[PDB]
Structure formats: C-alpha cells, structure tokens
Design an enzyme around this catalytic site. Structure first.
Site, PDB file in Angstrom:
ATOM      1  N   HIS C  97     -69.867  29.069 -31.053  1.00  0.00           N
ATOM      2  CA  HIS C  97     -69.509  28.062 -30.020  1.00  0.00           C
ATOM      3  C   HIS C  97     -69.414  28.704 -28.626  1.00  0.00           C
ATOM      4  CE1 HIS C  97     -67.989  23.756 -30.281  1.00  0.00           C
ATOM      5  NE2 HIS C  97     -68.375  23.994 -29.023  1.00  0.00           N
ATOM      6  N   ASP C 120     -65.865  18.863 -32.762  1.00  0.00           N
ATOM      7  CA  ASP C 120     -65.472  20.150 -33.387  1.00  0.00           C
ATOM      8  C   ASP C 120     -64.094  19.965 -34.007  1.00  0.00           C
ATOM      9  OD1 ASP C 120     -64.719  22.848 -34.047  1.00  0.00           O
ATOM     10  OD2 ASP C 120     -65.141  23.588 -32.008  1.00  0.00           O
ATOM     11  N   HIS C 122     -62.042  22.311 -34.170  1.00  0.00           N
ATOM     12  CA  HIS C 122     -61.232  23.157 -33.263  1.00  0.00           C
ATOM     13  C   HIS C 122     -61.336  22.572 -31.854  1.00  0.00           C
ATOM     14  CE1 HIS C 122     -63.773  24.777 -36.335  1.00  0.00           C
ATOM     15  NE2 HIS C 122     -62.835  25.627 -36.703  1.00  0.00           N
ATOM     16  N   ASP C 124     -61.414  25.056 -29.272  1.00  0.00           N
ATOM     17  CA  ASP C 124     -62.069  26.241 -28.659  1.00  0.00           C
ATOM     18  C   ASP C 124     -61.688  26.292 -27.173  1.00  0.00           C
ATOM     19  OD1 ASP C 124     -63.008  25.495 -31.092  1.00  0.00           O
ATOM     20  OD2 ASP C 124     -65.102  26.131 -30.819  1.00  0.00           O
ATOM     21  N   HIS C 137     -65.140  32.322 -30.240  1.00  0.00           N
ATOM     22  CA  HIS C 137     -65.604  31.157 -31.034  1.00  0.00           C
ATOM     23  C   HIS C 137     -64.708  29.973 -30.674  1.00  0.00           C
ATOM     24  CE1 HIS C 137     -67.893  33.625 -34.245  1.00  0.00           C
ATOM     25  NE2 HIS C 137     -67.822  34.285 -33.079  1.00  0.00           N
ATOM     26  N   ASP C 228     -70.029  20.999 -32.808  1.00  0.00           N
ATOM     27  CA  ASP C 228     -69.726  22.099 -33.750  1.00  0.00           C
ATOM     28  C   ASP C 228     -69.901  21.531 -35.155  1.00  0.00           C
ATOM     29  OD1 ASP C 228     -68.787  24.153 -35.255  1.00  0.00           O
ATOM     30  OD2 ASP C 228     -67.070  24.679 -33.874  1.00  0.00           O
ATOM     31  N   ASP C 230     -68.659  22.478 -38.028  1.00  0.00           N
ATOM     32  CA  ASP C 230     -67.396  22.497 -38.817  1.00  0.00           C
ATOM     33  C   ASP C 230     -66.692  21.133 -38.727  1.00  0.00           C
ATOM     34  OD1 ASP C 230     -66.491  23.100 -36.081  1.00  0.00           O
ATOM     35  OD2 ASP C 230     -66.587  25.203 -36.547  1.00  0.00           O
ATOM     36  N   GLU C 273     -72.113  26.775 -34.920  1.00  0.00           N
ATOM     37  CA  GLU C 273     -71.211  27.256 -36.007  1.00  0.00           C
ATOM     38  C   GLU C 273     -71.919  27.081 -37.362  1.00  0.00           C
ATOM     39  OE1 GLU C 273     -67.562  28.428 -35.378  1.00  0.00           O
ATOM     40  OE2 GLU C 273     -68.538  28.797 -33.442  1.00  0.00           O
TER      41      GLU C 273
HETATM   42 MN   LIG Z   1     -66.303  25.183 -32.105  1.00  0.00          MN
HETATM   43 MN   LIG Z   2     -65.480  24.439 -35.035  1.00  0.00          MN
END
Ligand SMILES: [Mn+2]
Ligand SMILES: [Mn+2]
Ligand SMILES: [Mn+2]
Ligand SMILES: [Mn+2]
Lengths: 317, 222, 318
Positions: C97, C120, C122, C124, C137, C228, C230, C273
């Site tokens: 990322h 995402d 996350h 980030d 990341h 992302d 994930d 990712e």
């Molecule tokens: Mn990310």
């Molecule tokens: Mn992620």
C-alpha cells in the site's frame, strides 16, 4: 470494567468429549492478552473440577458422569456467585452448553432480576425425560425455567438447582435446528425467539433492538449472554457439536456482541461447544478458537473501527 | 520513565541451552527493533543478534548463527534469546539494546545486563561465617564487623545488613576466584563499640544461582 | 476511455516478499483482455523500477530499504503525472500500500482538487515514528494529509512529497483492523470513514451515497480509488500479507466499484496488498488475482445486467 475468567471442561461421554480442551484452545488463542488490551481487570480462576471422566465405561454414562456434572455445575454456580458478588463480570469458557445451568444459577443468586440472551442454533431446552441418553448438553434451559419445573424430574446431582428465570426473561437468537417438543415448549410457554428467518426478514440490527425492548424494555437489568459457537455458519465455526448450515455471518455475531456491550449491562457471558477434536486441521481449530476470542472481546468493547485505548497526542520528531 | 530489564541468566554445561528474556516499558515496544550485545569477562562489546520491531526479521553474528534464536512478543513487551549448543566461549553478560536507524545504526537504550556462565563446574551455594569484630576494640570508639561468603559458584551473591536497615558504614568487597576455580567475598560494617552491647547485627546473603538466602548473626566471642 | 496500467513491485523484506509478483499475478489473470473488452484504450507501462537488495537482510531494512521505497514512489509519481497529463486514467497494480504515496502525489500534480476513496481493512494512516519501519504498509496517508505534517518527520528518500489532500477529502471504506493512534488521528483530525459496523448499520448502498455526498457533494472532482485487497473477507481474499476476518462480501466490493464507475469521475485506481506467495495453493492465489481483475473491471464499467456494450438491434427472419 473487571472480568473473571472461569474454565469449565464439561463433557457427555466418549465420542462427544474433547470440548474440555475448549477453554484451553480459547486461552491459547490469546484471550487474556486481548481482554487485557481492552483495559479490564483480569482474574482467571483456571479450569474447574475436571473430574477425569471416571472409568470411561460401565454405567458411568448412565449415572457417574451425569451425577458428577450436576455437582460440577453446583461448584461453578458457587465460583460465579463469589466472582459476581466481588463485582466482576463473569466469562465462562466451555465445555458443553450444560455449564449454562451453574452460570445462570450462580449469577441469579446476587442478580435475581437478570435476563438471558441465548445465541445458539439450538434452543437447548428439552426436559430430562426427553434426553437422548448422551444427555444434558442440549436441554440445560429447562432446570432454569420457573414454569417448566412441574414437568422436569429431580435427577442425581441436581437437587440444588432452584428455577432462576421466567419464560418472558430469556430471548433466543440464531435458531436453525429445533426438536418438536422444544418448538412446542417455546410456543406453549410463550418464550420469545428470533431464528435465521427473523434475522433475514428483519436484519440483525432490528433483532437486537426488539431483544432489548423485550428484556430491558421497562426496567434496567443485568444481562447474561450465553453464546453457543454453533450459532455461526459452520464455514466460520467448523469445530463445534451438531453444527447447522445457514448460520450467522461473522459481522452479525460481532454486531450482536457489540450491541450487547453498548447497553452497558453485560453481567456475565458463556462461550460454549468449542470442541477442537471436531476440527480436521490445525487451521479449522484455531479459526474457531480465534472467532470465540473475538466474540468475548466484542462483548467487552473491542470495536474493529479501532480500540477505545486512550491516546492523548502523537509523537514529535 | 523508560527501562529495559534482562532476566534468565544462569549457569549451563557444555552442550546445554538457555532462554534470556528482556522486559521493556515506557515506549511502544513494537515501534522499535531490538538487539542482543554481550561483554565477555575483561573484553569489549560483541554484537550477537537483532530483530525487526514489527517482528519476523532476524540477523545473527557468524559466531552465534544457527545456535542462537532471537524472538519477541510485542503484546507482552518482551524480547528473548534462545541459546542452544552453548560452549565455554559464550560466557559473558548479555545486554538487550533498543536499535535506532534514524540516519545510521546506533543502540540508544540498554538494560542492566544478565550473566551467562558456560563452565563444566557445578553451581555451589556459599558457607557464611561470622567475622569476630575485635577482642581489643570492645571498650572504646568503633570497631569493624563483617560476614565471610566462601566457596560459592558462579557469581553473584548480594549482601545487606539487618535486611538493609543498616547501610551507613557498610563496605562489600568484590569476590575472588581461588585456584580451585570457585568465588569468595566479604562485607564489613563499622558501628560504635558502645552500641554493640545492645544492637543486633545480621548480614543477609542471597545466592540466586543455588537460591540460598542465609541470615547470619555476628556478635563478639569470649 | 483510455487506461494506463503501471506495475509497482514494492516489498518490506523476506517476510512481505512476493508483492513484486503482486502485479504479474493480476496481469496473468487476464486484466488486459477484460479492460480491452470494456472498450478501454490500454497502454501497459510494464513493471516499474523494483525494491530489491544485494546481500539482503543486514541493516538494509531501516536504512537503505526505506530510502529505496521513498524514491521508487518518486519515480511512480512521475510516471503517473505523465500518464494523467496524456489524458489516461491510471491503474496501479501492487505491491504494498506504500505505492499509494507516489500515485496520489503524481495524480495531484495535474488534478490538484482530487478526492480519495480508501477501500482497505486498515487505515494505513500511521507516521514513520508512530510505528516500526515495516515499509509503511500502513503509513502511506500521513505523507499526503496536509493536516498531519507538523507530526511527521522528513525521512531519507521522502524529501520530494508535498501534502496533496485535506483530511475532509479522503473517505475510508472497509475498516476492520485499526491501531490505537490511527483511530485517534481519524477522530482528532475529523477524517470521515465507514467500517464494517457502519456497513452493517446502513448497508453498502447508503455508504456509497454518503461517501459521494461528502467528497463530490458540492463540486465534481476527479476521484482516486485506492483499493487494498485485504478489504474483502479473507475467505474471498486469502493471498494478502495481513488478512482481517469479517471483511466485505464479493457483491459489496463490486457494488462499491460499480457505484464509483457511475459517478463517471474515476481518474486513477490502485489495487494492492495482493502478494500471492501468502497463498497455500494455486487456487488461493488465482482466486485472489481473479477477484482483483473483477474489482478493476467493475470500476471501469463491467456490471451484472447489460455490461455496457449497448445493443439496439432487434433481429427476426421477416
Ligand atoms: Mn492498505
Ligand atoms: Mn489492507
Ligand atoms: Mn447450545
Ligand atoms: Mn448449538
């Protein structure tokens, strides 16, 4: 808050045992670290009696394990009563769902105006006359209902249990498998429940909103969350007992636990039927165990959008 | 406000193994990489190993490569060092050190260290003998009085007086290895002679390596 | 339209290695064929200058390793600025990322009023000093938020980055795994986000409606979709470095991408990712890669009913 962790390795004989490792698996999934991180006082009471399932033969099935179970629940109820009087919220790791007898009993001794939320695919509400001989894992509720008492038999080891809760004070969520009598009991005694259909037809959010309007609608009361792991879709929860397909999504069970936390009145929790022997692989085991940890944690505040962990300001270079 | 604290130092025989731990507190442990540096007796510093702050990235000195094993647990704010097939050569103090890579390489915060002894000798607890203050120095002024800590292995022993209540006039000396390859030391305290008549004096000797904690009264003889 | 495809093989080290095969996997899942079929003019710029090492390990990580990324992002931002000025929409295959630094930077150079949608698990949005040097990341947003600059350190290789976007101009979707500071940053700096709770609360449909009312409510702006992998529940997206459970359903992520397309303002996209070494099996790898292809394609028009390709013919044997 403060949180008390109670291991209760219960069983219903060979071919159904292994759930005793249930608490240890949840522990080994970092239960303590995660509840610690939420900023809650952690007193772990280790495992309970764990009577080494006598001679694993004989009439032990018929009388020795059931008598020992009934009494094991008595011991548990004592520990719970003690923990709850000392101001702790009670986490009970299982173990078979039968430990619900002791926990709701021991909880009721200082919190007699408590209500129950039963998250499970099954209603676990048979009479002991209706037992499948592999007995008590799925008929624990009966002993606790104070309207099914005149129709339930005084058993060896269960002399101590006095009916804690009314029929209008337990609400079920997650119903997918139900024996005919249980359906009858629920309709007959006018017990409130929300199955997958109700979940699909109303949405998880409305289920919790109705559930709270029923239980804590007109009076603030302590809540006992009994969470059976089979409640989640078997894809999520593959290491359980009598798992049924069409179960709750990961996000729905977090949403329940989260909602329960927001009410603020969570007084005790049970996490049960977490048998790792059932798993084909290490990953299947750990994924179920890890799911458990999440459910407990979500109930005690863990928010996914970021923890409530205080941060005054960020660093300076 | 920020500390590192090493533990799990001990004696281990040839072929043997041992796990060193390092407690951190006062920073985000997982925010920084860590490092194990050792100091052999009467030699300079020597780098052993280091680990990424995120975790899962391990580097080793060619001396310890494939025998030692760095690790950590950020949830519990702890670094570790599993040491296998240890030989006499590995004997040193092992200091856990916070590693900083802001422009170049520098270790910005160390622990108090922890001793590792690899000798093929056996951990022995001490004999503790009372030191006669002075038959002569009984009447006037002051007089020295002490404890002998003899025939213990390996280091270290710690000495306090009346459970640490008496520390003014206390002097504890470094140990010395005899030709028998075994450690001995003494701790002496100076008090007024007049007080000796009716003030109790007891040295507390703690030997972690044999977990012997002896309390020994010292008072004059005939 | 026209679409530019940029491979950006970023990595942290042996632990997060395989992100470089990240793009090649999405490519090998027939990304080109599918975007071709949508009617998009396709210039693929191959894989961008890498992030490798010589001896590897050593002190590279925490010194040379992050310098390499910081400058790699500089190169990327240049290619993106060039591709975006030439009139192309920019597809950036990842890679970690971190590459989002360069892409949002390079995009902002010709599209200074751009807004970001961050799909995402996350956020980030850590700094370089508020977390380990784990190759950022989860640090690519700090360098780009103008409000966070007084709390970020000038690092070696990141001298070039000027903060592109305000805090009220990025919106997050898919949050599941947020570190303590990140939540603080988001609440503190008043950054709008919709996590799984908010998804379950209102439904994906309301999330996209609110998202667009925030970002492009009062003025049409070019949109930067940073996706992302994930973000999707790990059952769907099993070949990512840091997979978080309870993630978006297949249908929800297509619905996002579809909604993004219908605004018509999509100017650049990042798909990251998706390091497939993480996969246990061939199928795990390809299924994640194939999911990626779908996400990009959905963002550029591919839908369930009609799928563009307008048909006004009405055949018979009259
Ligand atoms: Mn990310
Ligand atoms: Mn992620
Ligand atoms: Mn049950
Ligand atoms: Mn069940």
């Amino acid at each position: 808050h403060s949180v008390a962790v109670i291991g209760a390795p219960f069983s219903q004989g060979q071919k159904r045992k292994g759930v005793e490792h249930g608490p240890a698996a949840i522990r080994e999934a970092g239960l303590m670290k995660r509840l610690s991180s939420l900023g809650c006082h952690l007193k772990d009471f280790g495992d309970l009696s764990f009577t080494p399932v006598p001679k694993d033969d004989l009439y032990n099935n018929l009388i020795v394990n059931p008598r020992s179970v009934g009494l094991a629940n008595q011991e548990l109820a004592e520990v719970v009563s003690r923990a709850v009087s000392d101001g702790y919220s009670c986490v009970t790791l299982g173990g078979d769902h039968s430990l619900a007898i002791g926990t709701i009993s021991g909880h009721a001794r200082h919190c007699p105006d408590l209500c129950v939320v039963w998250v499970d695919a099954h209603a676990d509400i048979n009479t002991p006359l209706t037992t499948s001989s592999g007995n008590l894992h799925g008929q624990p509720v009966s002993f606790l209902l104070r309207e099914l008492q005149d129709k339930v038999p005084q058993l060896p080891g269960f002399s101590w249990i006095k009916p804690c809760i009314s029929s209008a004070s337990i609400v079920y969520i997650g119903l997918r498998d139900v024996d005919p009598p249980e359906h009858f009991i629920l309709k007959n005694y006018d017990i409130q429940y929300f199955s997958m259909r109700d979940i699909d037809r109303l949405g998880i959010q409305k289920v919790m909103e109705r559930t709270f309007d029923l239980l804590i609608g007109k009076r603030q009361r302590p809540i006992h969350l009994s969470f059976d792991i089979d409640a989640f879709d078997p894809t999520l929860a593959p290491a359980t007992g009598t798992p049924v397909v069409g179960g709750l999504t990961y996000r729905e069970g977090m949403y329940i636990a989260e909602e329960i936390h927001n009410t603020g009145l969570l007084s005790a929790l049970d996490l049960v039927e977490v048998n790792p022997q059932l798993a084909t692989s290490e990953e299947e085991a750990k994924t179920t165990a890890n799911l458990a940890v999440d459910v407990i944690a979500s109930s005690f505040g863990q928010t996914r959008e970021g923890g409530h962990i205080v941060y005054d300001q960020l660093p300076t270079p | 406000e920020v500390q590192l604290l090493e533990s799990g130092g001990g004696l281990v025989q040839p072929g043997g193994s041992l796990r060193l731990s390092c407690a951190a507190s006062g920073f985000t442990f997982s925010s920084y990489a860590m490092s194990w540096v050792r100091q052999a007796p009467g030699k300079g510093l020597e780098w052993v190993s280091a680990i990424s702050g995120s975790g899962g990235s391990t580097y080793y000195a060619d001396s310890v490569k494939g025998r030692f094993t760095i690790s950590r647990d950020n949830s519990k704010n702890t670094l570790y060092l599993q040491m296998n097939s240890l030989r006499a050569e590995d004997t040193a103090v092992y200091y856990c050190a916070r590693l900083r890579a802001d422009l170049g390489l520098y270790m910005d915060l160390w622990g108090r260290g922890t001793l590792v002894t690899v000798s093929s000798a056996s951990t022995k607890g001490p004999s503790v003998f009372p030191l006669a203050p002075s038959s002569k120095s009984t009447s006037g002024g002051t007089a020295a009085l002490g404890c002998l800590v003899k025939d213990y292995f390996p280091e270290p022993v710690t000495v306090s007086w009346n459970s640490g209540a008496l520390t003014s006039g206390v002097h504890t000396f470094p140990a010395v290895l005899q030709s028998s390859g075994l450690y001995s030391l003494s701790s002496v305290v100076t008090v007024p002679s007049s007080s000796l008549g009716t003030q109790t004096y007891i040295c507390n000797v703690n030997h972690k390596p044999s977990n012997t904690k002896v309390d020994k009264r010292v008072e004059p003889k005939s």
